[PDB]
């Protein structure tokens, strides 16, 4: 009999039961999607969309639902942060229920196709035995895929009939679902350009329908037919697995490095935005412009929105988490509740001191307050270690601009050390660490979890492609030698 | 609708059972400390 790892090979020469098992898998996938959406809506907290975005609460399916236009719920709230009017059928709960019903229907269809398998459709008219004309099925399926791709790219993203897609400004402050006009030209291959999505989908749909027609009309050559073993079905599996892990690599890379298809308002900021001081540079430029206008320090620093300062914080960096630090970010370092402001450190002489920000790659980084030219001026020494430039000796004073703590100056060395440690991470924020019993250690963004899972799956599927290609190209000796 | 020719039965001898049980218990021993954190 079959060993435990060969049980699913009983449908290798029975098209009806193959259709049945593939239907069962589709039903399971749809049911998972529906159940996960329902759970996410049950857990989601839409109270504050500024300091508590959906990517902060460890939401995985909600960003993907929101990416394509689902922005309302039957609970009376919207993802933007306004009251929901006439939500309609296509809400979060509606999508989850629709997926569940689809899963049930697919389950019933799978049961039917399993029960009745001896169909005349799968019988060769000449020989009378089960057969599949793989090139023609491929042509039909490619035709359908191209048609669907063109429809999506011409009616959904363009907003002609559909709702559009999520687009945001470069710094992720004002984003929403909008129609996207196609962008033909050198751009569009610019990954961060939303018009590339529409242009690509339209062009790829046209090419796909043309190729489907070709593969439907033209028979393969005998040399190619024998070379690629088009008579067998396992070569189809090997090629499909190959394309699948290729796609997995591409999607994981696009997710990790960011793109127009992965907005930061839905999945969170990127490791490389913290590496290059993206938000820090934007904030500095804005405050410098306000200062040069003629305003003082306090009012200029108060103009900075809390969202932009929140993005400039190492807690939201997806590369600061851990493998077994499970859960949402809010369980990591509490729920953000307010922005204290920008902290300026000044020695007794008057020189402004800047604290060196922790690189995204260190677990523990010593706190150092540098001069304007980079010379070290102050530093908290290692625990219980003799010091020569400590905070107490140098006499560093911290003053805050904008935010909750505006115009307040502290001179006590203890609070100065505390705020220096806080500012080592970036912007200082007040955190509620009691609601969720947060541990105190950073978790990882949904971006990081998605990338990790999909790269691991892609590697495993590369191995699967190797194995199945070897099996299909060595069938004579694999017949049980 | 008729007796399907593709009929086969799965088997698992005692050695395979011991291998599987040992693998499961060893993996649990290795990962329990991490999961409990």
């Amino acid at each position: 009999g079959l060993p435990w790892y060969r049980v699913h090979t009983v449908v290798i020469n029975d098209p009806g039961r193959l259709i049945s098992v593939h239907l069962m898998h589709t039903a399971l996938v749809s049911g998972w999607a529906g159940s996960m959406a329902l759970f996410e809506i049950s857990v989601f907290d839409p109270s504050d969309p500024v300091l508590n975005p959906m990517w902060r609460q460890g939401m995985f399916v909600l960003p993907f639902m929101t990416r394509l236009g689902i922005t309302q719920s039957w609970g009376g709230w919207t993802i933007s942060g306004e009251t929901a009017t006439n939500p309609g059928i296509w809400s979060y709960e509606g999508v989850a229920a629709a997926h569940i019903i689809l899963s049930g229907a697919l389950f019933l269809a799978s049961v039917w196709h399993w029960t009745y398998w001896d169909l005349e459709l799968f019988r060769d008219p000449r020989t009378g035995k089960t057969a599949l004309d793989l090139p023609k099925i491929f042509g039909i399926h490619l035709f359908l895929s191209g048609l669907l791709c063109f429809g999506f790219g011409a009616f959904h993203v363009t907003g002609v009939f559909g709702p559009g897609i999520w687009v945001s400004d470069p710094y992720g402050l004002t984003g929403r679902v909008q129609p996207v006009a196609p962008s033909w030209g050198a751009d569009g291959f610019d990954p961060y350009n939303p018009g590339g999505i529409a242009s690509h989908h339209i062009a790829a749909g046209i090419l796909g329908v043309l190729a489907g027609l070709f593969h439907l009309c033209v028979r393969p050559s005998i040399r190619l037919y024998f070379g690629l073993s088009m008579g067998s079905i396992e070569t189809v599996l090997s090629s499909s697995i190959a394309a699948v892990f290729w796609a997995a690599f591409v999607v994981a890379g696009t997710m990790w490095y960011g793109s127009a298809a992965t907005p930061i308002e839905l999945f969170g900021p990127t490791r490389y935005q913290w590496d290059q001081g993206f938000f820090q540079q934007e904030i500095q430029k804005r405050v410098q412009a306000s200062l040069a206008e003629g305003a003082s320090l306090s009012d200029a620093w108060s103009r900075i929105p809390e969202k932009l300062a929140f993005y400039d914080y190492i807690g939201n960096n997806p590369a600061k988490g851990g493998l077994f630090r499970t859960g949402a970010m809010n369980s990591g370092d509490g729920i953000a509740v307010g922005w204290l402001g920008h902290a300026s450190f000044k020695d007794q002489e008057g020189r402004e001191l800047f604290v060196r920000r922790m690189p995204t790659f260190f677990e523990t980084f010593p706190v150092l307050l540098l001069d304007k030219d980079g010379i070290v001026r102050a530093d908290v020494p290692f625990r219980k270690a003799e010091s020569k430039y400590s905070i107490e000796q140098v006499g560093v004073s911290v003053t805050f601009y904008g935010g909750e703590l505006d115009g307040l100056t502290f001179t006590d060395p203890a609070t100065v050390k505390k705020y220096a440690r806080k500012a080592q991470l970036g912007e200082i924020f007040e955190f509620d660490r009691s609601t969720l019993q947060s541990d105190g250690v950073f978790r990882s963004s949904p971006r990081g979890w998605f990338t990790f899972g999909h790269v691991c799956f892609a590697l495993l599927f590369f191995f699967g492609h190797i194995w199945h290609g070897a099996r299909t190209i060595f069938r004579d000796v694999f017949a049980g030698i | 609708a008729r007796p399907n020719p593709n009929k086969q039965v799965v088997e698992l001898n005692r050695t395979s059972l011991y291998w599987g049980l040992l693998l499961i218990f060893v993996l649990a021993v290795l990962f329990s400390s991490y999961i409990f954190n």
């Binding site: - | 039965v9 005692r14 499961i24 649990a28 999961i35």
Partner: peptide
């Protein structure tokens, strides 16, 4: 601890039940 304990219990029980079912199926036919 509820998450971890539940996961450990399920991981211990379900695969062992599957393996035992397969073995008992095998051992019936001598």
């Amino acid at each position: 601890n509820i998450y971890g304990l539940t996961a450990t219990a399920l991981f211990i029980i379900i695969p062992t039940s599957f393996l035992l079912i397969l073995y008992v199926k095998t051992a019936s036919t001598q």
